[PDB]
Ligand binder design. Sequence first.
Ligand SMILES: Nc1ncnc2c1ncn2[C@@H]1O[C@H](COP(=O)(O)OP(=O)(O)OP(=O)(O)O)[C@@H](O)[C@H]1O
Length: 529
Amino acid sequence: TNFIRQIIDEDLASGKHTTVHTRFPPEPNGYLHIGHAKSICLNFGIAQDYKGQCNLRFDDTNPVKEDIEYVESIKNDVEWLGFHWSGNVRYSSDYFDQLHAYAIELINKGLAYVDELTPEQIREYRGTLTQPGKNSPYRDRSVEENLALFEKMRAGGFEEGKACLRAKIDMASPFIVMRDPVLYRIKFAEHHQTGNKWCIYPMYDFTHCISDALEGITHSLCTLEFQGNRRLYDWVLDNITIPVHPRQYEFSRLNLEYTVMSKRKLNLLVTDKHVEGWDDPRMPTISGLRRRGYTAASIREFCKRIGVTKQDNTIEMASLESCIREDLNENAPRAMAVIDPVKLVIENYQGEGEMVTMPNHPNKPEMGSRQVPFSGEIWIDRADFREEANKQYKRLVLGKEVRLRNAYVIKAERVEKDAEGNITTIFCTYDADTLGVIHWVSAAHALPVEIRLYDRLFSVPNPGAADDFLSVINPESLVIKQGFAEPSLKDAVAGKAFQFEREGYFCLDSRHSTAEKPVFNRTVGLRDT
RNA sequence: GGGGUAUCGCCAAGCGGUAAGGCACCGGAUUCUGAUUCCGGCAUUCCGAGGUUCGAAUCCUCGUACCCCAGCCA
Ligand SMILES: Nc1ncnc2c1ncn2[C@@H]1O[C@H](COP(=O)(O)OP(=O)(O)OP(=O)(O)O)[C@@H](O)[C@H]1O
């Protein structure tokens, strides 16, 4: 329960409403991100919790910033999270004729006029945050005059910025938004849905409340920056012949630590090619998060945890990571892979190898097991062997013995160094009666696999508050290794999380893998305590 | 000038009857993943100072801090 559900509860109880109809209205000018996933969870969750409806509506009022590529991807990520909208996908452009009729009602009532103050002047006349504005000299044109000028606008007789339609409200209102807000502006741009049918386009505030009213939305839920806007939401509905009047309720937007959400910015990372694109595994986008190896279930959980309040806030990545870990620990089948490897040969070994039956899940016998080939000449992780180390160190020291994962208790003996003092190979003994744990991969049956170690994109917690967020990008956000994995990883499917034991949960990058060379993105590391 | 918000390091519940929960953190037990699981510790205190009350985070003053708004963006 949250403050919005308590409102919805009262409404139902008092008999204000019988059903609840919410909506998610992204503008199609970019890919959805983790913050959007919070609206999706809120809006679609309430609908299904109350057996109500939730429309997916593309708020497509600004043609020059939107593109058809985003509509298809948005529908894509909404479904992926496991949510379905009510009926058909809707578009604000679906209401362009309605919106136009409504502007006319306003004009006929004298509550709107065609102003000719330039784009620079309108700002000058608007006042400031402490100084009231002033009426444009074009404010008292006759209704008959406004209809003519508006139709001329509609007919493309005015150049961009040469005229716009404004609401005749209050230039001295303490709400900057009520200072004669623009309702329509001229843009000679092709619209991704309406082609070149329209050269005048409605502004968010005029389009949004009328669309909600037409769709019979009972509660418009948006973020806190729209609290002021709400006054205009109600003013529009109060002055046009519409039979319902939805109510807006604002909650606080999600801010994730170490990442930026501003689509303007995310777009710059993609435009300047600093990431591979919107679905780069370092991006806070839903598709990026998906390619990274997250699961819709881990995200819905994240939403459940962070809550819905009016408080500004900033979640730590630790909270997000906790979610995916919890999910993958349960459902991810374990496997073996070595990221940085140094060869290890057991001399006391007899035979061209053998087979070790390893389980697909150490805490869930029900998941089955597999035949992992064991051998004498294997591959181990460089950071697992140490010539000298204290008690704490519970791995392979040049002195004692260590257990190979589900195999034999080997025993370090000699080490063969390369010219530059680097260990090239290790020599050890073992006693076949055995069967300090480390992971390994039989060199003979090792599958060369590229591993991508992803880290946080930025090196400060609020790169948003930086003068130049770009200069604060983490150069180690992606570190590419070459390692080896047990041959079973040959059958991995894109987006199927595996837990490389003692490393983390990884998943096959569908975008870079092939036949010989598979690419694995590291979703999240283990609790490296 | 106006509109909001103030509860553990980060989220968050509480709606006059005496501070839930989660992430993180610290221990202690188990463990062929320094993982998982288990055990326990984690706000006499709710931005501050004063009021009312038997009892206030919650009600009342009176301050303080932060966030939002001046796109023909959403
Ligand atoms: N960080 C966020 N946290 C919660 N809800 C968000 C967040 N960002 C956007 N939303 C929600 O998603 C809805 C659709 O957002 P929309 O795509 O229209 O714009 P935006 O993403 O907020 O802005 P921009 O295009 O500049 O990134 C908004 O009405 C809002 O409720």
